[PDB]
Amino acid sequence: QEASLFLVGERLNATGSKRFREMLFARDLEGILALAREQVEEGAHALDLSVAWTGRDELEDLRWLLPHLATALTVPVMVDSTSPEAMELALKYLPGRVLLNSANLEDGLERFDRVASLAKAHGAALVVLAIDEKGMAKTREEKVRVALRMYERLTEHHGLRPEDLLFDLLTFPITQGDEESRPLAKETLLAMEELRERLPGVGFVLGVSNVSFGLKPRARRVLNSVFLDEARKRGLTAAIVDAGKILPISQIPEEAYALALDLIYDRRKEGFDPLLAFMAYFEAHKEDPGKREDAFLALPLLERLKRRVVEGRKQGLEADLEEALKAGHKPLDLINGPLLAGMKEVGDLFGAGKMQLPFVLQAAEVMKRAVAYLEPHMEKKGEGKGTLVLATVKGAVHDIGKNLVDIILSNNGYRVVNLGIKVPIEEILKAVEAHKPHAVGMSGLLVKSTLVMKENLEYMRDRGYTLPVILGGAALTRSYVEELRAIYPNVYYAEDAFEGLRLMEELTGH
Numbered sequence: 001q002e003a004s005l006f007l008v009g010e011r012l013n014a015t016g017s018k019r020f021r022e023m024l025f026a027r028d029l030e031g032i033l034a035l036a037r038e039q040v041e042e043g044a045h046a047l048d049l050s051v052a053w054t055g056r057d058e059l060e061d062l063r064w065l066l067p068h069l070a071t072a073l074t075v076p077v078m079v080d081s082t083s084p085e086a087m088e089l090a091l092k093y094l095p096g097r098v099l100l101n102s103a104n105l106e107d108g109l110e111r112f113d114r115v116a117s118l119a120k121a122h123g124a125a126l127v128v129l130a131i132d133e134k135g136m137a138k139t140r141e142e143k144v145r146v147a148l149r150m151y152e153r154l155t156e157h158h159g160l161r162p163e164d165l166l167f168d169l170l171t172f173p174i175t176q177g178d179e180e181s182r183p184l185a186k187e188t189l190l191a192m193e194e195l196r197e198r199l200p201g202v203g204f205v206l207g208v209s210n211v212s213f214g215l216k217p218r219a220r221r222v223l224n225s226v227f228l229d230e231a232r233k234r235g236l237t238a239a240i241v242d243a244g245k246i247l248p249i250s251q252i253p254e255e256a257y258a259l260a261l262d263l264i265y266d267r268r269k270e271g272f273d274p275l276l277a278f279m280a281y282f283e284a285h286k287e288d289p290g291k292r293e294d295a296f297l298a299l300p301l302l303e304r305l306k307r308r309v310v311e312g313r314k315q316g317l318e319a320d321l322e323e324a325l326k327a328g329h330k331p332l333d334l335i336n337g338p339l340l341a342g343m344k345e346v347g348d349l350f351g352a353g354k355m356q357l358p359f360v361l362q363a364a365e366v367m368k369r370a371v372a373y374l375e376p377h378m379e380k381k382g383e384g385k386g387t388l389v390l391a392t393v394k395g396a397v398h399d400i401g402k403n404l405v406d407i408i409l410s411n412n413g414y415r416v417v418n419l420g421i422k423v424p425i426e427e428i429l430k431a432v433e434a435h436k437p438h439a440v441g442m443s444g445l446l447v448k449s450t451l452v453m454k455e456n457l458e459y460m461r462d463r464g465y466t467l468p469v470i471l472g473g474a475a476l477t478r479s480y481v482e483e484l485r486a487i488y489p490n491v492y493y494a495e496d497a498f499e500g501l502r503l504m505e506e507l508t509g510h
């Protein structure tokens with residue numbers, strides 16, 4: 001329509017493409033030049049280039065590759081770097097054909113102006129990321145604030161033309177399933193629309209592929225393509241894409257289109273989760289939606305509760321729990337029986353490669369809602385028997401166990417200070433000094449997490465501590481915690497939350 005979109009080929013990027021990385025390391029010139037020509041045939045108008053890698057001499061790599069790209073391509077190169085010397089080198093070999101990638105305010109005005117001056121001086125296009133000193137702009141209001149500040153500086157101090165600018169309000173993944181990043185696509189799109197109006201004549205660019213990160217190939221292609229189009233509609237001029245894997249909107253089935261939008265704009269309904277629905281669309285072995293729903297509703301009460309956790313079925317949960325409390329079913333039994341049995345099954349399915357990670361998250365969300373609704377119906381016996389600082393150790397994220405321990409001990413008269421997850425030993429002991437607890441609990445599921453526990457106890461030993469530490473987790477074995485007593489004589493293994501209770505009871509003298 002208004003003008004075609006300037007496509008930038010993403011593939012020559014050490015951070016992004018594993019294939020390019022390995023090609024670069026191996027010094028596969030023919031491989032790289034093939035990959036460049038290929039992207040242009042597939043419809044790219046320019047090529048992003050990033051050779052920066054942890055432990056590699058950026059400048060060396062560029063000195064090698066650039067002379068070749070120079071002669072072997074007609075199209076422009078977008079140089080993706082934080083080193084000005086690198087940008088200079090690129091500007092040397094490819095005069096007139098360069099767009100400079102990062103220019104931003106993360107480390108203040110110093111870095112920003114250095115890059116901008118180059119752009120001005122070598123008459124190169126400039127990309128401007130919406131990142132300031134407080135970090136990445138995640139909302140529109142932020143993305144706009146930052147852009148405008150930058151625009152002022154670029155146009156007045158450097159005298160760059162609007163036309164010479166490309167604003168990258170950022171592209172975040174919305175596919176990992178965490179609640180916090182549901183609207184980060186939407187907020188970018190809103191900013192773009194507002195800035196197109198307030199800053200006429202500037203360009204906009206996005207690294208489109210990111211929005212979809214870690215979905216199946218086919219799903220990415222759709223989500224990428226719909227995002228690209230919606231950004232275009234709101235003023236996008238350039239796009240860092242895989243040119244060969246963007247579908248025109250006319251070729252995307254109506255359902256997939258709508259699901260992609262549902263996800264991008266976070267159009268939550270009552271009984272719908274956009275992300276999971278979008279994922280589900282691409283899965284094969286699709287039953288009659290009505291047939292599946294009927295098969296489910298036909299299950300026994302306990303078996304249906306289980307399947308709610310596995311299939312991640314939030315809606316009608318409180319209904320079913322209400323029903324089970326009406327029959328002779330006790331809260332703790334519903335958890336330690338059908339609900340946790342579901343959680344085990346999720347484990348096995350994820351382990352077999354039969355379930356993707358966000359579905360596991362949604363399973364956990366059903367479990368948490370379930371326990372939230374059941375917590376008032378559990379017995380609340382005793383009060384103020386003692387205190388427990390409880391936490392998941394460095395680099396461990398699983399916490400359904402931890403939280404059950406919280407609930408059960410809290411219900412049996414213990415004060416539980418739950419420090420949440422990934423808690424370093426420093427922070428744990430800070431809270432120990434604060435709350436003066438009778439014991440410390442450390443959760444962690446994976447093997448590596450047990451070695452952290454060992455380190456944690458070494459640390460605690462060395463700073464004089466002797467209060468009881470209760471360790472729990474899958475990979476933990478009682479035999480192993482017995483050995484740890486050589487480091488810290490007051491460690492205890494806990495198989496389950498009830499053992500935690502039993503230990504706390506013995507330790508406080510009940």
Ligand code: COB
Nearest residue numbers: 347351397398399400401441443446472473494496497500
């Ligand atoms: C009650 C609780 C229910 N179960 C659960 O919480 C979930 C079990 C499940 C299915 C795992 C398989 C399984 N069958 O266990 C699995 N995940 Co998960 C896919 N996971 C998740 C889920 C958790 C969500 C949450 N908010 O907690 C997440 C998506 C976040 C998840 C994430 C990961 N997961 C991952 C993996 C690999 C595994 N995950 C496992 C643990 C498992 C075994 C499954 C697998 N499939 O292979 C993998 C680990 C193998 C191993 N190392 O040995 C990984 C790396 C996946 C990824 N590639 O990103 C990632 C971990 C990142 C990291 N550590 O940073 C889940 C759901 C699982 O059991 P529990 O053992 O925690 O508690 C139990 C409890 C009950 O009474 O008391 C005990 N206890 C535990 N701690 C303490 C105590 C008791 C006391 C008294 C204490 C003071 C502390 C005792 O250990």
